[PDB]
Amino acid sequence: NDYCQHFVDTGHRPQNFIRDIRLKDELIAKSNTPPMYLQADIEAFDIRELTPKFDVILLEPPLEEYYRKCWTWDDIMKLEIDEIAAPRSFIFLWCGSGEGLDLGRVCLRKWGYRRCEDICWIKTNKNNPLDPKAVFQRTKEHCLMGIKGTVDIDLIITEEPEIGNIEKPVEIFHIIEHFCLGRRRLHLFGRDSTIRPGWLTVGPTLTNSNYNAETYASYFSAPNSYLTGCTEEIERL
Amino acid sequence: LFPPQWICCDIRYLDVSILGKFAVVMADPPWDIHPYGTLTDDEMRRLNIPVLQDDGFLFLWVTGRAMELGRECLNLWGYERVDEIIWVKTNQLQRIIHWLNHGKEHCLVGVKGNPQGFNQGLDCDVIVAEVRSTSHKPDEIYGMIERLSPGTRKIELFGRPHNVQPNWITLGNQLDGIHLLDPDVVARFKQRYPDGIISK
Ligand SMILES: Nc1ncnc2c1ncn2[C@@H]1O[C@H](CN(CCNc2ncnc3c2ncn3[C@@H]2O[C@H](CO)[C@@H](O)[C@H]2O)CC[C@H](N)C(=O)O)[C@@H](O)[C@H]1O
């Protein structure tokens, strides 16, 4: 059965027809720092104030293409991500499906990472059967994984969200957390709706803030400076 | 011609200028990713892709670090990457098969020049199709390529015998001999290769 032909015939995307650990999530949840968040206009904001250096950065700038303030790849590329990333650390960069697939890789290289996974968010249209340069209908987005220093699959499948909904699948958080990469986790351009235990969310649309660098850093003082996020908390007194 | 045509060769040494111009180029190169016969990064860069097209599309399979290197070659060869096809690899029951398990392979889409009269936007950028033998890419890509550019000349690089299709010329070192029917090509091949085959 040719699902490409079927989509030409009927409009049902080929991905519509793809068919179809607990203890770990529990250790992740016990290990999680309280959610912390900070309203900041990131164009105007000195990210160096975000300390300590992060083990994981999730970067979700609002691209023009999500809306059919927007950030161009010009703005993104000028972010000083490398000044807040721990010497060994990871980045997850949402790149969309256009030129971001190329310009996001330049970014990763500019900030000192190499790509090790290309995670694809494939969008079904079961409930509802173009860029000028596009050759094809674009039905997916890419989240690039980068590493600097020395169970899950690289696909997320969900239904296409309603128009004007720019939220990315919460599954990206489970994939990141299941890598057990460290507990300093930063979400740049997160939102009220994305705040989440074990994460520091920084974005311009947050309506409240509770971030305090000293308080935040106290979650990772000894004996907890090197925990992976997937181990039992270290016993005290 | 129109039926399948092919040329067993080493694509490094074939004077591909004898083949003329194609509306679409597809390639599945044996990138030297860190087992069974590869091309070095420099050999890949030096491939004489630029003579194959004036205006049209390149389809370039990539995996691993070829995702970045293939973008280099793609740009060096004179293309702009305008799309990226994802083949979701399934079994016969439509279930998906370092840090993450890989459920897919990638096919970069480059444009060169200004193509006109292609039916852009008929297919979507996701393929869902059954894994066959190792490295055997899905046949759906030929239907997508045919709807996009019906009846035009097309050329596949690093094809195996099962890759040969109508309107395509397949080059690869595991093809059986030389099978050419387009008289223009037959004439240019006999001029350049009177005694049959050469190197460097
Ligand atoms: N100098 C030369 N001149 C002319 N021909 C040459 C020259 N050298 C070599 N050849 C011939 O090219 C052909 C190349 N085939 C190999 C193409 N690449 C790849 N190899 C290996 N794994 C690949 C891969 N792609 C994707 N994966 C996936 O990745 C994982 C492991 O990496 C796995 O999960 C894989 O699944 C082309 C296949 C052809 N499209 C089909 O559809 O069968 C083959 O015949 C060679 O002799």
Residue numbers in the entry:
A (entry chain B): 117 to 136, 153 to 200, 209 to 269, 275 to 295, 309 to 395
B (entry chain A): 368 to 401, 405 to 467, 474 to 576
Quote the passages of the study that discuss this structure, keeping the authors' original sentences.
The complex of methyltransferase-like proteins 3 and 14 (METTL3-14) is the major enzyme that deposits N6-methyladenosine (m6A) modifications on messenger RNA (mRNA) in humans. METTL3-14 is the catalytic complex that transfers the methyl group from S-adenosylmethionine (SAM) to the substrate adenosine. The METTL3 MTase domain has the catalytically active SAM binding site and adopts a Rossmann fold that is characteristic of Class I SAM-dependent MTases. METTL14 plays a structural role for complex stabilisation and RNA binding.
